[PDB]
Amino acid sequence: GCRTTASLNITDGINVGEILANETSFSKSVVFTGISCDTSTDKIVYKNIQSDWVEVGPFGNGEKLKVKIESLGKTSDTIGKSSNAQAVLPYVVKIARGTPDFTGERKSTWFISDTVIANIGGESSSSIDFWLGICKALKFNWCVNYLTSKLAGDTFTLGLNISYYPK
């Protein structure tokens, strides 16, 4: 079994530069720290929980963006017997132009809570998939908190602040 004494809810930021192309990619990574496992088979299981577009905005000029976790570098990592371990998960964020909204309140930064999670409580990928499907069926606006409540043990979560400053 594994436990963690580091922060479970990590937030990172992506500052989108104004470019003419309607799509762009960011290669990033997130580090889950403070991990302690006592068994050689103990592992951390990663899951992309935002593989489809989610729209954010409007930004300063009424533009909206579409964001998705395009792909992960890994699906899991064997931690084994380690008392001060960490797990580095690389991922790719794809950002595209969305439908503009000139009427809504405009913000320069928008938070996306559902991106990636990493369970170290012995949940399999199939269990996380099942609970995510349940969450989708129940029509929750977001699923990160429901998934952390339904998954056993500790679940690192990543949130992404998307910033965009068009002139």
mmCIF file of C-alpha atoms in Angstrom:
data_model
loop_
_atom_site.group_PDB
_atom_site.id
_atom_site.type_symbol
_atom_site.label_atom_id
_atom_site.label_comp_id
_atom_site.label_asym_id
_atom_site.label_seq_id
_atom_site.Cartn_x
_atom_site.Cartn_y
_atom_site.Cartn_z
ATOM 1 C CA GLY A 1 0.000 0.000 0.000
ATOM 2 C CA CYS A 2 0.947 3.627 -0.569
ATOM 3 C CA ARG A 3 0.295 6.924 1.174
ATOM 4 C CA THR A 4 1.310 10.524 0.559
ATOM 5 C CA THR A 5 1.994 13.479 2.851
ATOM 6 C CA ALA A 6 2.370 16.040 0.037
ATOM 7 C CA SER A 7 -0.342 18.187 -1.508
ATOM 8 C CA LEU A 8 -2.884 16.080 -3.387
ATOM 9 C CA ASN A 9 -4.406 18.914 -5.451
ATOM 10 C CA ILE A 10 -1.802 20.388 -7.787
ATOM 11 C CA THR A 11 -2.574 23.396 -9.975
ATOM 12 C CA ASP A 12 -0.462 24.360 -12.989
ATOM 13 C CA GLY A 13 -0.803 27.158 -15.515
ATOM 14 C CA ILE A 14 -0.595 27.456 -19.288
ATOM 15 C CA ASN A 15 -0.091 30.935 -20.745
ATOM 16 C CA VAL A 16 -1.388 30.724 -24.317
ATOM 17 C CA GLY A 17 0.406 33.070 -26.678
ATOM 18 C CA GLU A 18 -1.580 34.778 -29.411
ATOM 19 C CA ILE A 19 -0.836 32.890 -32.626
ATOM 20 C CA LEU A 20 -2.689 32.672 -35.915
ATOM 21 C CA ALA A 21 -3.044 28.883 -36.014
ATOM 22 C CA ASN A 22 -6.319 27.594 -34.611
ATOM 23 C CA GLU A 23 -4.600 24.802 -32.644
ATOM 24 C CA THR A 24 -1.511 24.458 -30.472
ATOM 25 C CA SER A 25 0.147 21.919 -28.197
ATOM 26 C CA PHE A 26 1.968 22.097 -24.873
ATOM 27 C CA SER A 27 4.248 19.298 -23.687
ATOM 28 C CA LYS A 28 4.124 19.428 -19.887
ATOM 29 C CA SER A 29 4.714 17.144 -16.928
ATOM 30 C CA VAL A 30 3.368 16.920 -13.383
ATOM 31 C CA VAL A 31 5.265 15.536 -10.382
ATOM 32 C CA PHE A 32 3.463 13.727 -7.560
ATOM 33 C CA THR A 33 5.620 13.885 -4.435
ATOM 34 C CA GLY A 34 5.761 12.655 -0.856
ATOM 35 C CA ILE A 35 4.902 9.066 -1.777
ATOM 36 C CA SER A 36 5.625 6.182 0.600
ATOM 37 C CA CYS A 37 4.968 2.575 -0.451
ATOM 38 C CA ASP A 38 5.853 -0.620 1.414
ATOM 39 C CA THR A 39 5.319 -3.379 -1.193
ATOM 40 C CA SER A 40 7.346 -4.205 -4.288
ATOM 41 C CA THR A 41 4.221 -4.393 -6.463
ATOM 42 C CA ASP A 42 2.848 -1.041 -5.264
ATOM 43 C CA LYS A 43 2.138 1.219 -8.231
ATOM 44 C CA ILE A 44 0.697 4.598 -9.194
ATOM 45 C CA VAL A 45 -2.030 4.548 -11.856
ATOM 46 C CA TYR A 46 -2.491 7.607 -14.062
ATOM 47 C CA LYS A 47 -5.727 8.506 -15.809
ATOM 48 C CA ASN A 48 -6.679 11.177 -18.322
ATOM 49 C CA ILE A 49 -10.107 12.480 -17.305
ATOM 50 C CA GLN A 50 -10.383 15.189 -19.983
ATOM 51 C CA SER A 51 -9.681 13.422 -23.279
ATOM 52 C CA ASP A 52 -12.430 15.422 -25.019
ATOM 53 C CA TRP A 53 -12.706 19.160 -25.527
ATOM 54 C CA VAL A 54 -13.787 21.378 -22.653
ATOM 55 C CA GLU A 55 -14.416 25.039 -23.471
ATOM 56 C CA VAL A 56 -13.166 27.955 -21.370
ATOM 57 C CA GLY A 57 -13.680 31.685 -21.696
ATOM 58 C CA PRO A 58 -14.675 34.251 -22.753
ATOM 59 C CA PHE A 59 -11.261 35.940 -22.567
ATOM 60 C CA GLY A 60 -10.467 39.648 -22.809
ATOM 61 C CA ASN A 61 -11.679 39.944 -26.410
ATOM 62 C CA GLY A 62 -14.608 37.507 -26.256
ATOM 63 C CA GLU A 63 -12.628 34.590 -27.659
ATOM 64 C CA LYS A 64 -13.084 31.163 -26.108
ATOM 65 C CA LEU A 65 -10.649 28.254 -26.172
ATOM 66 C CA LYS A 66 -11.110 24.486 -26.289
ATOM 67 C CA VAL A 67 -8.739 22.395 -24.158
ATOM 68 C CA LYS A 68 -8.115 18.664 -23.894
ATOM 69 C CA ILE A 69 -5.450 16.330 -22.547
ATOM 70 C CA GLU A 70 -4.282 14.980 -25.899
ATOM 71 C CA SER A 71 -2.183 12.095 -24.593
ATOM 72 C CA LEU A 72 -0.242 10.776 -21.617
ATOM 73 C CA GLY A 73 3.312 9.478 -21.682
ATOM 74 C CA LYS A 74 2.526 6.573 -19.354
ATOM 75 C CA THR A 75 -0.438 4.756 -17.835
ATOM 76 C CA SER A 76 1.177 3.597 -14.580
ATOM 77 C CA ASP A 77 4.474 3.328 -12.741
ATOM 78 C CA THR A 78 5.725 0.663 -10.342
ATOM 79 C CA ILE A 79 6.785 2.461 -7.166
ATOM 80 C CA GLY A 80 7.837 -0.605 -5.205
ATOM 81 C CA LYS A 81 9.191 -0.438 -1.672
ATOM 82 C CA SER A 82 10.123 3.235 -1.308
ATOM 83 C CA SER A 83 9.608 5.595 1.627
ATOM 84 C CA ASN A 84 10.322 8.920 -0.156
ATOM 85 C CA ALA A 85 9.252 8.348 -3.764
ATOM 86 C CA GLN A 86 7.879 10.523 -6.547
ATOM 87 C CA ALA A 87 6.145 9.962 -9.880
ATOM 88 C CA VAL A 88 6.675 12.158 -12.946
ATOM 89 C CA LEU A 89 3.838 11.964 -15.471
ATOM 90 C CA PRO A 90 4.308 13.735 -18.825
ATOM 91 C CA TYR A 91 1.264 14.804 -20.798
ATOM 92 C CA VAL A 92 0.318 16.865 -23.839
ATOM 93 C CA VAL A 93 -2.334 19.587 -23.702
ATOM 94 C CA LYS A 94 -4.010 20.525 -26.984
ATOM 95 C CA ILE A 95 -5.664 23.962 -27.112
ATOM 96 C CA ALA A 96 -7.888 25.102 -29.984
ATOM 97 C CA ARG A 97 -10.139 28.051 -30.735
ATOM 98 C CA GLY A 98 -13.708 27.731 -29.500
ATOM 99 C CA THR A 99 -16.981 29.480 -30.182
ATOM 100 C CA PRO A 100 -16.664 33.157 -29.182
ATOM 101 C CA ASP A 101 -18.893 34.692 -26.522
ATOM 102 C CA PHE A 102 -19.213 38.478 -26.561
ATOM 103 C CA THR A 103 -21.940 38.558 -23.881
ATOM 104 C CA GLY A 104 -20.500 36.595 -20.954
ATOM 105 C CA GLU A 105 -18.250 37.901 -18.217
ATOM 106 C CA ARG A 106 -14.667 37.939 -19.477
ATOM 107 C CA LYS A 107 -11.646 36.736 -17.506
ATOM 108 C CA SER A 108 -7.974 36.521 -18.429
ATOM 109 C CA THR A 109 -7.577 33.176 -16.627
ATOM 110 C CA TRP A 110 -9.949 30.200 -16.469
ATOM 111 C CA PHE A 111 -9.603 27.095 -14.295
ATOM 112 C CA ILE A 112 -10.108 23.543 -15.591
ATOM 113 C CA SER A 113 -10.406 21.093 -12.706
ATOM 114 C CA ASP A 114 -10.562 17.897 -14.800
ATOM 115 C CA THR A 115 -7.302 17.050 -16.558
ATOM 116 C CA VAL A 116 -5.317 14.187 -15.021
ATOM 117 C CA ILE A 117 -5.413 12.107 -11.844
ATOM 118 C CA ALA A 118 -3.022 9.605 -10.276
ATOM 119 C CA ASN A 119 -4.212 7.007 -7.774
ATOM 120 C CA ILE A 120 -1.896 5.265 -5.312
ATOM 121 C CA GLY A 121 -4.597 3.492 -3.309
ATOM 122 C CA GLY A 122 -4.486 0.325 -5.382
ATOM 123 C CA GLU A 123 -7.253 1.243 -7.818
ATOM 124 C CA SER A 124 -6.914 -0.293 -11.260
ATOM 125 C CA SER A 125 -7.375 1.604 -14.505
ATOM 126 C CA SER A 126 -10.645 -0.290 -14.996
ATOM 127 C CA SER A 127 -12.001 0.927 -11.648
ATOM 128 C CA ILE A 128 -11.154 4.547 -12.442
ATOM 129 C CA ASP A 129 -12.727 4.128 -15.883
ATOM 130 C CA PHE A 130 -15.876 2.702 -14.283
ATOM 131 C CA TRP A 131 -16.200 5.543 -11.783
ATOM 132 C CA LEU A 132 -15.545 8.148 -14.488
ATOM 133 C CA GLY A 133 -18.254 6.608 -16.657
ATOM 134 C CA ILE A 134 -20.618 6.720 -13.692
ATOM 135 C CA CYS A 135 -19.736 10.387 -13.150
ATOM 136 C CA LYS A 136 -20.475 11.153 -16.800
ATOM 137 C CA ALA A 137 -23.792 9.289 -16.621
ATOM 138 C CA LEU A 138 -24.793 11.309 -13.540
ATOM 139 C CA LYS A 139 -24.211 14.499 -15.574
ATOM 140 C CA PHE A 140 -21.777 16.083 -13.125
ATOM 141 C CA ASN A 141 -20.346 19.329 -14.478
ATOM 142 C CA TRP A 142 -16.917 18.212 -13.236
ATOM 143 C CA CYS A 143 -15.664 14.812 -12.125
ATOM 144 C CA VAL A 144 -12.381 15.332 -10.245
ATOM 145 C CA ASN A 145 -13.953 15.663 -6.790
ATOM 146 C CA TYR A 146 -16.444 12.845 -7.359
ATOM 147 C CA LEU A 147 -13.599 10.603 -8.525
ATOM 148 C CA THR A 148 -11.427 11.434 -5.518
ATOM 149 C CA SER A 149 -14.415 10.711 -3.268
ATOM 150 C CA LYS A 150 -15.154 7.353 -4.925
ATOM 151 C CA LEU A 151 -11.560 6.116 -5.356
ATOM 152 C CA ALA A 152 -9.861 4.368 -2.455
ATOM 153 C CA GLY A 153 -6.751 5.755 -0.835
ATOM 154 C CA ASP A 154 -4.952 8.864 -2.038
ATOM 155 C CA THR A 155 -5.581 10.399 -5.464
ATOM 156 C CA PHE A 156 -3.398 13.184 -6.811
ATOM 157 C CA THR A 157 -5.390 15.571 -9.003
ATOM 158 C CA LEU A 158 -4.138 18.164 -11.489
ATOM 159 C CA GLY A 159 -5.940 21.372 -12.379
ATOM 160 C CA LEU A 160 -4.932 23.744 -15.162
ATOM 161 C CA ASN A 161 -5.261 27.532 -15.229
ATOM 162 C CA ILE A 162 -5.561 28.623 -18.880
ATOM 163 C CA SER A 163 -4.458 32.201 -19.587
ATOM 164 C CA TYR A 164 -4.838 34.052 -22.888
ATOM 165 C CA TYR A 165 -4.241 37.773 -23.501
ATOM 166 C CA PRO A 166 -5.343 38.657 -27.043
ATOM 167 C CA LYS A 167 -5.084 42.295 -28.095
#
